[PDB]
Amino acid sequence: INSMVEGVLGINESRQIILSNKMANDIMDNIDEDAKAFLLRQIEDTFKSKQTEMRDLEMNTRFFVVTTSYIDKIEQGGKSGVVVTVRDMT
Amino acid sequence: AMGRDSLINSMVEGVLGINESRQIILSNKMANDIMDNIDEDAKAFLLRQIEDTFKSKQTEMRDLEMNTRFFVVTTSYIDKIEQGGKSGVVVTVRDMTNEHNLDQ
Lengths: 90, 104
Prior knowledge:
Subcellular location (chain A): Cell membrane
CATH superfamily of chain A: PAS domain
Helix content of chain A: 25-40%
Shape of chain A: globular
Number of domains of chain A: 1
Oligomer: homodimer
CATH topology of chain A: Beta-Lactamase
Structural class of chain A: alpha+beta
Number of strands of chain A: 6
Strand order of the largest sheet of chain A: 2-1-6-4-3
Distance between the termini of chain A: 15 Å
Radius of gyration of chain A: 13 Å
Number of helices of chain A: 2
Protein name (chain A): Sensor protein SrrB
């Protein structure tokens, strides 16, 4: 876990997390409710747009670039979803 | 006319999920397109980056040319990518040729 590791989450149509790495777990435990709501909004937009959304989530003293991409194809445990990647730019 | 999306340039990254068995367990259409059109050397470079990520267990970023276009590939390690317990790598591929304006 470093600012050089990206946070990754996979989320299915049911809004269940079906995969995550340590860095995503860490990011989620260390961000506030406003940032979480911003993230949720971006995820919801990606389900709708069905394309890639890329947004800055500027914190106080921290700066993340959040990418969310729509996935139509999942082997087991999902039909569709969104893959979230979070890069700490600071 | 003007609509809700007039100011949006519709961008798409390629996404692949790969388990311990080196099987693709998830993908989007753009990644499918990449894979259907990829040369053998580019495929080996992609595979190599994935292999390096299984080893490093952190995020790798590399430039990859495919059919003259400039891609940036990011690969990140996932300790448990599926419910059965396999680790994996999430691959995201960004088209930088599309980012640029040289085709105008």
